[PDB]
Symmetry: C3
Subunit: 320 residues, 3 copies
Amino acid sequence: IFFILVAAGVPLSVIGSLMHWPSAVLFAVYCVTIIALASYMGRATESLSIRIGGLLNATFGNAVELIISMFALKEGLTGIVLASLTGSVLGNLLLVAGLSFFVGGLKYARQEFNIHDARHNSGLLIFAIIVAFVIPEVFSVGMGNASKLNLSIGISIIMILLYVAALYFKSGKVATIVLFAATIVVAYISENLVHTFHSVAEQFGWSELFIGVIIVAIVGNAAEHASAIIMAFKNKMDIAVEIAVGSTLQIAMFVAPVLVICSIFFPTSMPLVFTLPELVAMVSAVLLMIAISNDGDSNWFEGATLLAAYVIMAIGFFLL
Amino acid sequence: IFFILVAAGVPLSVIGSLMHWPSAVLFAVYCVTIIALASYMGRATESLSIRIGGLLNATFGNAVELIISMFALKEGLTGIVLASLTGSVLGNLLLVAGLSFFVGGLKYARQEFNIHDARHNSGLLIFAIIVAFVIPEVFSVGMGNASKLNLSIGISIIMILLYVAALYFKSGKVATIVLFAATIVVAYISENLVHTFHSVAEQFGWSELFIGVIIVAIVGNAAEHASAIIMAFKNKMDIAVEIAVGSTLQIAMFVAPVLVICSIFFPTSMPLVFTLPELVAMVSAVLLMIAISNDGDSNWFEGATLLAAYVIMAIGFFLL
Amino acid sequence: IFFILVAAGVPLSVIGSLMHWPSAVLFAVYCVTIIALASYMGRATESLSIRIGGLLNATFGNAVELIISMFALKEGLTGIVLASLTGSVLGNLLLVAGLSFFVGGLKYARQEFNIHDARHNSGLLIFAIIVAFVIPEVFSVGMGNASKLNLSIGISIIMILLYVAALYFKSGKVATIVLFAATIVVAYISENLVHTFHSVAEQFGWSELFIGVIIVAIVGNAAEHASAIIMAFKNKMDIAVEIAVGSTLQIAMFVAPVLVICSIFFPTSMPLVFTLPELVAMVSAVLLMIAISNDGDSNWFEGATLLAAYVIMAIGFFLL
């Protein structure tokens, strides 16, 4: 199934792009293609990593999210970037953790734990989300654009520093070849993807928010980290947990700060400004994760809980 | 005392209703009557339950709340329904748990624990409250009524499913007779109670919110679960805790979803839309409960803490 | 260094006040002086305390905060009072705990714990902050001034009662002499400090909020409790933790209620009304504290986390 979706994806995505027919179906072709490419992009990142390993983990483990957002910045579609960063933490904490706890929840009794790590990894989540996303949002309302992105830059610079500082202290040959392949393919698909967003909104009626928080996030970040759902089935939950939380952590502490600083160069800037639904969805998820990482790691319904929360948010983001 | 308040209550409530004198005192007569009826309604529900036991626990354990809200929907007084559902979680988490921890707090040393269950029961509370009440509220502001109650219906359908799924997996003869008696009596009292609400507001100056969140909630849900305060005195705290949290859980996951779906039939619908004070009171209580269920189960001041929070909210709901 | 800042401070503060030159530099002279005086005020409070000990701990341990706010009330500058009470919990939870966890974080392995106390002290924090500061704020929007300060008075009266009730149940000669000295000196410096606030705002461009939440709070409360940073270095973390959380607790439960009731006498009243940034900064800090008090008590980066949160808030309060 993984090979088929790539082998069909790229050709179709080339021909559709060349023919320019039509604006609607091109979206559907792009999204499915990148899903397949993203898993392979995650497997290559994983296999390469199995000191500098953490850097490639934060860079290439979130690469499609970085890539899609990069071209979104060129088109000035800064809302979608924020939407996708919102949706990347949602997916990690509620979908790729939810499906790991549900699908891997056939073992039934309990699940692999490192209580020390789970309780420490919530300690950073709160810091990452409940401060460094909440604080800029609420402080920014009556700030003015200059001070807005200065605070963003301020938070962004310290979040990468505090992420990289802890990181500094605390087959293999095909990995680089396939990673170099998938990247460029994705990049070229992503460039044309950004131009599709305005038509999809009008023709379907969907809000650009829905597209960003859900469609772009599932395809991009969530697919890259779908290795955790498989890892949960092979009774290695503590890594499936480690992947979900860790990825979210680097999205909040590295990826989002990366985007904010780099957005200042072209054309011009995006501050860490999240809508109310986007913000409260993120904290609720974080709280629900701390409330689920504490207890038994998993159960079928415990994963169903995390999933129930997601679909609700998703349909809420659809209905706005 | 329990027999007297029923024996005086019903007759008085019949004569006052027939005489139609006056609109003000009828309220006072109704409320006191139902208090007495509700404890007996809780005792019958308990005795009947001591697989299907969980259904009658969620149905008849919250029956007066369902009954008062049912006729409130017929009068179109949808605000009071939301107010009473707000006040049912408040009472459970802060009053009937607060008085269990205070009155039963004469033991002094510690109190009956099941740390596994308390930590798991917070995990669902957050899901139930901090997502499935918060998310609909904040997402709904700029949604439009169609999408509003569609999201409500959406959340409602999955919350009952997720509640009933876990429930499916995981003297006695007088119980049904007294339960069948109390129900009908309550129902007929409740029908006439709803019509009293508009006059009480005007003549006293009270907001309909105050009446719903406090007066209706204490009389209805809190009285039904007052068995926990007695159970705490008999040094069985872990059931007094189990009652408070469990009841709140089924209010958020079964009762409130029940009301939302059924409200669509007559005349027309109520979405899960809570005011700001109603919403933030509910999360604060939930957080304070997790902060108090973790530590020693009880102490006198630990129960006084939970009670101090309540009276504050109550006078705040009075002063709005 | 401690002697020099007092010995230079008072004289300079006398001469500058007499000469009336200028409005700008007088601020700088006052603030530095009180920093030095406040540590000595904390040492005297500590040495006196090492039943009634808890009263002097809550009174004189927060004395400069009480003193600066007292004269702020006379000038009617009620915003600064709320700003400084906001900043006193911020500092305690993020600065004086952050610097204790960072500077004392050279031990490296772990740090002194009393998990029972830390988990209990969060239980009151949530109550103190997430209810008794949040609830009055959100409930007050559409209340009217009469009901506003009535709710404040209501919350204030029960918070001191609930604080004093638990307290009731549960060199030395120079201490009183130096405490009596520092108080009067501070009081006279503070009186002239309040009059400086309006010019500093205009001439620098700073918001009076920034001054209150940060400048007044660091100088006042944070300096008094800087003993904890030293105590962390002497490998006595559990007292450095006890100081930070305890002080915050008495600020929320005694100091702030003290100010509210006493403010009603002159000239007229201040309700517990906090701006949105002030409120969300306080809960985020509290959450981050619970997320950091749970795990290892300290690590260098764990203290750097708490500090990173602070500077962000601080620059956000600067940029508003």
